[PDB]
Amino acid sequence: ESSFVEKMKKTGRNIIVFYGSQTGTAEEFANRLSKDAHRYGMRGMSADPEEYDLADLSSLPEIDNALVVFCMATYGEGDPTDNAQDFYDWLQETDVDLSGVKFAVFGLGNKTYEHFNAMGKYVDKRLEQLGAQRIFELGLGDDDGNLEEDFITWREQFWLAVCEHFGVEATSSIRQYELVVHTDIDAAKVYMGEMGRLKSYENQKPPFDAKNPFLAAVTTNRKLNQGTERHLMHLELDISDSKIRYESGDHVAVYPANDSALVNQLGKILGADLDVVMSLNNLDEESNKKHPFPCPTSYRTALTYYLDITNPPRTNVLYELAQYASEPSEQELLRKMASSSGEGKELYLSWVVEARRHILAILQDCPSLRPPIDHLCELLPRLQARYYSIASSSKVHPNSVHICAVVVEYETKAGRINKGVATNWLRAKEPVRALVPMFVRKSQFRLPFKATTPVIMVGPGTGVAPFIGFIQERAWLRQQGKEVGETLLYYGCRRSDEDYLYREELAQFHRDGALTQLNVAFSREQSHKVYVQHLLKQDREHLWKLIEGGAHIYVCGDARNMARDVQNTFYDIVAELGAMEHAQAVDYIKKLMTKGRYSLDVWS
Ligand SMILES: Cc1cc2nc3c(=O)[nH]c(=O)nc-3n(C[C@H](O)[C@H](O)[C@H](O)COP(=O)(O)OP(=O)(O)OC[C@H]3O[C@@H](n4cnc5c(N)ncnc54)[C@H](O)[C@@H]3O)c2cc1C
Ligand SMILES: Cc1cc2nc3c(=O)[nH]c(=O)nc-3n(C[C@H](O)[C@H](O)[C@H](O)COP(=O)(O)O)c2cc1C
Numbered sequence: 001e002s003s004f005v006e007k008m009k010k011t012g013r014n015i016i017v018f019y020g021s022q023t024g025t026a027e028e029f030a031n032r033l034s035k036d037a038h039r040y041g042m043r044g045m046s047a048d049p050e051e052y053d054l055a056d057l058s059s060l061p062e063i064d065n066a067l068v069v070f071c072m073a074t075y076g077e078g079d080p081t082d083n084a085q086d087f088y089d090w091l092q093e094t095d096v097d098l099s100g101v102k103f104a105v106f107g108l109g110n111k112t113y114e115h116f117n118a119m120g121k122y123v124d125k126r127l128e129q130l131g132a133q134r135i136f137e138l139g140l141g142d143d144d145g146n147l148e149e150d151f152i153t154w155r156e157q158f159w160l161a162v163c164e165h166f167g168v169e170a171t172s173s174i175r176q177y178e179l180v181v182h183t184d185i186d187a188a189k190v191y192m193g194e195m196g197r198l199k200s201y202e203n204q205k206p207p208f209d210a211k212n213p214f215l216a217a218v219t220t221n222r223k224l225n226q227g228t229e230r231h232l233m234h235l236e237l238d239i240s241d242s243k244i245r246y247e248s249g250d251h252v253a254v255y256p257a258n259d260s261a262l263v264n265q266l267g268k269i270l271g272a273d274l275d276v277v278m279s280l281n282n283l284d285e286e287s288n289k290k291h292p293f294p295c296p297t298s299y300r301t302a303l304t305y306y307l308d309i310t311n312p313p314r315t316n317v318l319y320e321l322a323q324y325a326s327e328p329s330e331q332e333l334l335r336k337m338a339s340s341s342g343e344g345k346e347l348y349l350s351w352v353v354e355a356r357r358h359i360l361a362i363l364q365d366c367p368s369l370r371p372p373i374d375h376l377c378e379l380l381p382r383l384q385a386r387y388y389s390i391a392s393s394s395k396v397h398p399n400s401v402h403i404c405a406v407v408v409e410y411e412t413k414a415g416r417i418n419k420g421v422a423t424n425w426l427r428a429k430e431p432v433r434a435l436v437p438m439f440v441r442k443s444q445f446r447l448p449f450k451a452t453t454p455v456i457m458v459g460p461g462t463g464v465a466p467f468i469g470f471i472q473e474r475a476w477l478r479q480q481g482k483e484v485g486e487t488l489l490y491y492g493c494r495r496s497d498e499d500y501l502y503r504e505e506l507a508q509f510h511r512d513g514a515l516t517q518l519n520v521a522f523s524r525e526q527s528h529k530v531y532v533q534h535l536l537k538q539d540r541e542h543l544w545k546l547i548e549g550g551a552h553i554y555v556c557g558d559a560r561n562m563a564r565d566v567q568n569t570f571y572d573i574v575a576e577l578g579a580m581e582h583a584q585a586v587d588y589i590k591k592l593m594t595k596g597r598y599s600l601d602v603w604s
């Protein structure tokens, strides 16, 4: 059915929760809200807007007590997720009267970005402009703090508002899927970790994307730093014959595999035979989501390629697990963590989040907790792809995508050693054949259209990644006999003799004349910190001349602190030498952003 309204009528639902999601968080929130409906005598369904036509919103009044909720994540430059693009485009062009429509919006965002929760804000603003009635205030989830707590707090107030407005009242853990063990299946009919189509990893056919990743051979995987302290690496993935295209500035996404050792420990503590092949089937026969991940598959495969077993669990997982803890003290600890406040919340933020306890850690520190592996597989979120800023230029390496990454490994307050999923998996890839499932995601981060336009690149640490590609390209341009403007790199590391990435490559680019200036800040070679913004300030005169002349600024790397400090430094450069007020310099820099002359590729 094309009309979600007709689907709702046919399936007896009065609440529909649409999700704008890229890495599954919004989808999970939408599913959790949909399931909540039953507690109020209502019935809901979650839905991917891309599968429908939101113009059908005007028909919602045909369903009694109809309510629509939107859980929307914001991405690149305050834009909608890919699956919410058509909806976004519709909202911009429509002027339909939505009188009679009742809605609520929960936005997923992160305050370290320039356009915080821009999508949620827009949807909430537009629906009101069109005439719809807001049932509860816009939720502003912030992943820079604790998105989960923002969500359960909003969710609680939301349902209270629903009860008050619709005159309904609140009324044991309900499985969404049922287990079927495939004891006699053909080995060839079993998923072994591929995404989407069965055997798609073995039988590789284009086009390659998120649902059909291209298995690229690792031609190179080399250590970039010295100490055994940290591990920074440079990988080169062969994309020959994939027809995949990219440009410096784009991101490469990879689908990792969890640590075999961690999976084995989970299997043992759960007393489950991980080699058992099974299928989890949706009890709702009318849902397009037939299984929680590719099935049939073994528990080992699911825990290795399909499920997230490392991220500290969200509160609904802990609440559902509580029923399987036989020790009273333990069961109470788990149940309490779903509280939106009080000791339950403090314990969740401290025992789970701050201590970075993953599922095995939780099962180990609550030994009486012994959940059935199949239910656990239904509760855990899907293992997501990780993004890396491509460190190569397609003008120089059209058949290879390079990655510059730092391995994640640290000790927790709970006395454990946590290892980042994608980085440790990538580190273990032996150069030619080791294959990496990947795809390219286009970005707006790009070199200037005119080669003569100067570029100011700021990227300390792994933030230097896209700029290695930028420099390669600018060098290539000069070799093509083209006039290229100044190319400046502001880089930084802790110590020149420990973590100075691409030291020799950058030095050669500078000797060649391709890299006009190589400005490096060594943060730990003095008592006080020396950062890239310190170097930018010292170079204020030249930078202002370039900015005034039309130069493009690029900032890549840490979003929580570096990006903000650097932006503040540029505000000062403009205010001081542009002879304008600080507030005018702020407007100036933000305007450069709208013109594509101040670009960001930051992350946490
Ligand atoms: C658009 C974009 C581009 C990116 N480009 C790059 C790039 O070019 N290079 C690169 O290296 N990375 C890049 N990243 C980060 C990259 O996608 C991964 O998040 C990173 O490699 C870690 O993944 P992982 O699977 O190894 O770690 P995960 O298993 O996902 O674990 C990461 C989490 O571990 C925790 N953590 C890490 N250190 C500590 C500590 N000391 N204490 C407590 N908790 C800690 C944090 O909660 C962190 O979020 C990018 C991210 C985005 C969104
Ligand atoms: C490439 C990228 C860009 C993002 N851009 C923004 C942004 O502009 N504004 C914002 O508030 N949050 C931004 N975020 C944060 C997400 O909106 C937040 O992590 C959300 O929880 C993701 O939901 P999802 O898992 O459903 O896709 C960005 C995240 C990524 C990975």
Ligand SMILES: [Ca+2]
Pocket: 517, 518, 519
């Ligand atoms: Ca200099």
